[PDB]
Design a protein around this ligand. Sequence first.
Ligand SMILES: O=C(NCc1cccc2c1OCCO2)c1ccc(-c2ccncc2)cc1
Ligand SMILES: O=C(NCc1cccc2c1OCCO2)c1ccc(-c2ccncc2)cc1
Lengths: 383, 380
Amino acid sequence: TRFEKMDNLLRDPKSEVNSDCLLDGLDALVYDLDFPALRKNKNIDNFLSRYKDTINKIRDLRMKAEDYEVVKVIGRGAFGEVQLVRHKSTRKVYAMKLLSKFEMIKRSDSAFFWEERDIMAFANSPWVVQLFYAFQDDRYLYMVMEYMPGGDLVNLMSNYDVPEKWARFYTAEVVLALDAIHSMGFIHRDVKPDNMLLDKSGHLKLADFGTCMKMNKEGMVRCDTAVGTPDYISPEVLKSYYGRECDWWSVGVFLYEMLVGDTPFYADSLVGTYSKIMNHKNSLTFPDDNDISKEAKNLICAFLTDREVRLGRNGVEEIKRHLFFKNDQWAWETLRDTVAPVVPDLSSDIDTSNFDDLTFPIPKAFVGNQLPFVGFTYYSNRR
Amino acid sequence: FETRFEKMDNLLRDPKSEVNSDCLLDGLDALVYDLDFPALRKNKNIDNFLSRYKDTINKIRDLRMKAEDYEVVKVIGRGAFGEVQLVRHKSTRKVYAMKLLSKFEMAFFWEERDIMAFANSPWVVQLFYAFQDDRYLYMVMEYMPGGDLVNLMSNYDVPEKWARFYTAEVVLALDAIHSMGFIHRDVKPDNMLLDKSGHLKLADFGTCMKMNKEGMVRCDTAVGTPDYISPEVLKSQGYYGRECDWWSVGVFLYEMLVGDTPFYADSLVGTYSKIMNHKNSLTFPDDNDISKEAKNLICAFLTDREVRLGRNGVEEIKRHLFFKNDQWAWETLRDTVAPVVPDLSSDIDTSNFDDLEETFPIPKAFVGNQLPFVGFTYYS
Ligand SMILES: O=C(NCc1cccc2c1OCCO2)c1ccc(-c2ccncc2)cc1
Ligand SMILES: O=C(NCc1cccc2c1OCCO2)c1ccc(-c2ccncc2)cc1
């Protein structure tokens, strides 16, 4: 009488077939059948009519988009948008990411949303933006995260001239956030200011995990295709078996851009950037007016080098030990407790002052377009 | 929100709910059966979903109730879509009567499962579990070792005092079914099972239907053996209620005291005709040993629904002169000693039961064969 194991498999928030996954299965089934063409099947019609009432009960009882008041669209992406939302009942504020099932089916080359949900739902790090709920519908996937009112690092870099002390803080927090992600067993693969967000008290948290890959037995990744951003992509990830050190190159690019005011491998043509990155040894130069310290250019150059040579090849302590990080404000351990360079000032809980103001074809035969999303919802069984 | 979260959660464990985890797991293991074929694995969605949940659902299959958790002792009954077999739970070493319905050979089973599982009456055979595999639907019940009333009528020339007891028990067991919101439609001895104390419990509910707003039923489906069926259900191709189950009772009282049904005819069509012509065909034998009281109680039930004893409620029935006796009182009837009490050898004794002794076709398109059985599973 070991029916106990059953309930565990049905209640564990990490289980492949918990209540969330079960409820998703039925929801998907009723979605992939309710088409007049398919309803010409007696087996299909009956089930549908018998389950009609309860599926409606369930759909309205479970989480859905109409439970959220959408305040403003505070972000856009390849397959959707990030909207600042307010939960009508609970009055709480969150950033909700939307993903189009149709778009992703048509253009995405991976099931990126799975590891992204899991990094945000279980990371339990002050360096990772957390997930509260994950849900879906006929059209979209939904990710309910904590709102980061201070905006991103692209906004900060534009609004201000970043001094070395400010740069030292932001670099240092990204180093800890990346060490947290590596400790969790992933490689970021796409580190950039777009993915660096700021909290109400001005501390960094990472936010786009669409390029995260689990490391193998030797902390490595076998890849055919290149992933990331044309400016911040390391020479290895571009040429396409790499390690965590790729994320550190992107940190070099991130430091260089904050101090110099432009990316180290800029080109007028987007393709010209590629040529430049490959020629990093003869394209990495600092402007004539060299106001940047000797210690700062040192860190930059110790990262903006070949995979084998790169600082952090022999662990993160090598990075922390760099002279550039020595300062009168914080120490690595006390960093997220110290005061931030830019402490914002927010009008309300919905203050968007740091953010720029902004389907599937009906089938003939059974296709099952909701089947590759079964298991996404993180509502009934969470930790 | 907190209420909407809790509703959904309470729902996942409510056994009377269409979305209890067992029903949700049903739909999932059903989706795997109905899609795991070479033709359908040519669709990346279908192929990938299957690859993803194949091994974990077969893990689920292994933990959940399966037929091979039971040792099949003897086939103690047979029916139009399977058989009733005496079974013992391999672990528990406990004995049950478990009914089988063939998926391939086959909706009627929904009301049979709910009545048995949720009646909670000493008059209804209990359903402990309801499960399923690819081919059959299993229904695990409490085993009734006294056998049916067919067997009783074979081994005795049923005396009146015995007839009265068994009649009063069908009256009470039907009223319990009536109070649950169902009409039987075809209550016959084959349905009247006897327990270790020789007391009644109704058992074949495939003929049952849920009453409407005004407490009535309408049906289009074929009748079968008309013998115990009322003229109203026979007229229906049309609404009727309560009173039809009382006609059946009157047939059963006539059988016990006369040896044959009142409208028996050599043919099915011939019987039906005698039922329609009931106010001319109903005859009492030349030298019957039937009471004045028993004869009135038959005719009262064997009349048009408009003038039938029981139209105005069960108490009109209960107050009848026939039921006047010193050996029992309606409210403590099941408490008195039954006229026939089984003398059983062991837990697997089948002395009171007669001795007793095809595939889905591999398809091209999504057929969805398992879909009508989604939600059959029930535990306790
Ligand atoms: O990853 C993000 N956007 C990328 C993105 C958005 C939509 C579709 C995408 C896509 O990327 C891959 C293609 O499909 C993202 C941006 C901002 C926040 C955020 C967090 C907290 N507070 C305010 C804002 C959270 C996430
Ligand atoms: O429903 C029954 N028989 C009818 C029948 C049996 C199988 C398949 C059928 C069918 O009818 C039409 C569909 O296919 C039934 C009879 C006896 C018991 C019983 C219970 C407890 N103890 C001993 C015996 C349980 C069930």
